[PDB]
Write a protein that holds these residues in place. Structure first.
Motif, short mmCIF file in Angstrom:
data_model
loop_
_atom_site.label_atom_id
_atom_site.label_comp_id
_atom_site.label_asym_id
_atom_site.label_seq_id
_atom_site.Cartn_x
_atom_site.Cartn_y
_atom_site.Cartn_z
N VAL A 1 11.68 2.24 -13.11
CA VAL A 1 12.63 2.23 -12.01
C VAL A 1 11.90 2.45 -10.71
O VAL A 1 11.17 3.42 -10.55
CB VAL A 1 13.62 3.38 -12.14
CG1 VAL A 1 14.61 3.37 -11.00
CG2 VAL A 1 14.33 3.32 -13.47
N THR A 2 12.14 1.57 -9.75
CA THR A 2 11.51 1.72 -8.44
C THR A 2 12.61 1.79 -7.37
O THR A 2 13.54 0.98 -7.35
CB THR A 2 10.54 0.55 -8.18
OG1 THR A 2 11.09 -0.32 -7.19
CG2 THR A 2 10.32 -0.24 -9.46
N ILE A 3 12.53 2.79 -6.50
CA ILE A 3 13.54 2.97 -5.46
C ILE A 3 12.90 3.10 -4.08
O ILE A 3 12.09 3.98 -3.85
CB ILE A 3 14.40 4.23 -5.68
CG1 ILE A 3 14.68 4.46 -7.15
CG2 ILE A 3 15.70 4.10 -4.96
CD1 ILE A 3 15.36 5.77 -7.39
N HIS A 4 13.29 2.22 -3.17
CA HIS A 4 12.84 2.29 -1.79
C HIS A 4 13.91 2.94 -0.94
O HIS A 4 15.11 2.72 -1.13
CB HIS A 4 12.58 0.88 -1.31
CG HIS A 4 11.80 0.08 -2.29
ND1 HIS A 4 12.36 -0.92 -3.06
CD2 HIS A 4 10.49 0.14 -2.65
CE1 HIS A 4 11.43 -1.45 -3.84
NE2 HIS A 4 10.29 -0.82 -3.61
N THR B 1 3.77 -4.32 2.80
CA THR B 1 4.70 -3.37 2.22
C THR B 1 4.01 -2.00 2.10
O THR B 1 2.88 -1.91 1.61
CB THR B 1 5.20 -3.88 0.86
OG1 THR B 1 4.63 -3.10 -0.19
CG2 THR B 1 4.79 -5.34 0.66
N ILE B 2 4.67 -0.95 2.57
CA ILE B 2 4.09 0.39 2.53
C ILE B 2 5.05 1.38 1.90
O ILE B 2 6.16 1.57 2.37
CB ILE B 2 3.74 0.92 3.93
CG1 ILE B 2 3.21 -0.18 4.83
CG2 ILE B 2 2.70 1.99 3.83
CD1 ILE B 2 3.03 0.29 6.24
N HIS B 3 4.60 2.03 0.84
CA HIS B 3 5.36 3.09 0.20
C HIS B 3 4.86 4.45 0.66
O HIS B 3 3.66 4.65 0.85
CB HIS B 3 5.19 2.96 -1.30
CG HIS B 3 5.35 1.56 -1.77
ND1 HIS B 3 4.29 0.77 -2.16
CD2 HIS B 3 6.45 0.78 -1.88
CE1 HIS B 3 4.73 -0.42 -2.52
NE2 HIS B 3 6.04 -0.44 -2.35
N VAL B 4 5.77 5.38 0.85
CA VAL B 4 5.39 6.64 1.47
C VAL B 4 5.59 7.83 0.55
O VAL B 4 6.57 7.89 -0.18
CB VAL B 4 6.18 6.87 2.73
CG1 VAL B 4 5.73 8.14 3.39
CG2 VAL B 4 5.99 5.70 3.67
N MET C 1 0.77 -1.23 0.00
CA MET C 1 0.00 0.00 0.00
C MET C 1 0.80 1.27 0.00
O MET C 1 2.01 1.27 0.22
CB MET C 1 -0.90 0.05 1.21
CG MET C 1 -0.20 0.68 2.37
SD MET C 1 -1.07 0.28 4.04
CE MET C 1 -0.56 -1.59 4.09
N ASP C 2 0.08 2.36 -0.19
CA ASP C 2 0.65 3.65 -0.41
C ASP C 2 0.02 4.57 0.55
O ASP C 2 -1.19 4.73 0.53
CB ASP C 2 0.30 4.12 -1.80
CG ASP C 2 1.42 3.89 -2.78
OD1 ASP C 2 2.57 4.28 -2.46
OD2 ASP C 2 1.14 3.33 -3.86
N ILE C 3 0.84 5.20 1.37
CA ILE C 3 0.35 6.23 2.27
C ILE C 3 1.08 7.54 2.06
O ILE C 3 2.18 7.55 1.52
CB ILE C 3 0.50 5.79 3.72
CG1 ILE C 3 1.96 5.76 4.13
CG2 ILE C 3 -0.11 4.42 3.92
CD1 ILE C 3 2.13 5.58 5.64
#
Lengths: 83, 83
Positions: free
Chosen positions: B74-77, A75-78, A40-42
């Motif tokens: 491209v994905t960057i964490h 998994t959380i993307h910010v 998810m995306d917060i």
């Protein structure tokens, strides 16, 4: 959609509502491997510290994990509110 | 490993070396759908602002995209150095 996915989704957000600093969750997706994975995306305060935001998602996962046994990983993307 | 993946990897990092605020990239992975997708993990200053870090990854992608035509997405964490 089925009654079941609905209950799940409901739970996730319910946990979410438990964090004040957390905003505009969207692109919340589920996956069912064996017996699920949520991603998810917060959004948070542009001015928030990366280290904090790190700490934040950790507690969310922890919380998530606590509330449902069916959840395997989270998994959380910010992002800065506004995108 | 093959000479080809190597050249790629080499490029990615070369772009990376172009950002000073960027540190400890690892878990850099590739995917080849049609003709590739790169995903990766970088560390930044706990004290960095989420909004900045956002801006950061955007330029990296942009840069990435510029340097090789073969790259689709491209994905960057991002994490606080130290994990």
């Amino acid at each position: 959609m089925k009654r079941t996915e609905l209950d799940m989704y409901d739970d996730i957000f319910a946990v979410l509502e438990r964090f004040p600093n957390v905003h505009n969750p969207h692109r919340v997706r589920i996956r069912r491997v064996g017996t699920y994975f949520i991603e998810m995306d917060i959004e948070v305060d542009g001015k928030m510290s990366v280290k904090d935001a790190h700490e934040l998602t950790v507690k969310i996962r922890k919380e998530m994990l606590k509330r449902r046994d069916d959840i395997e990983d989270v998994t959380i993307h910010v992002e800065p509110l506004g995108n």
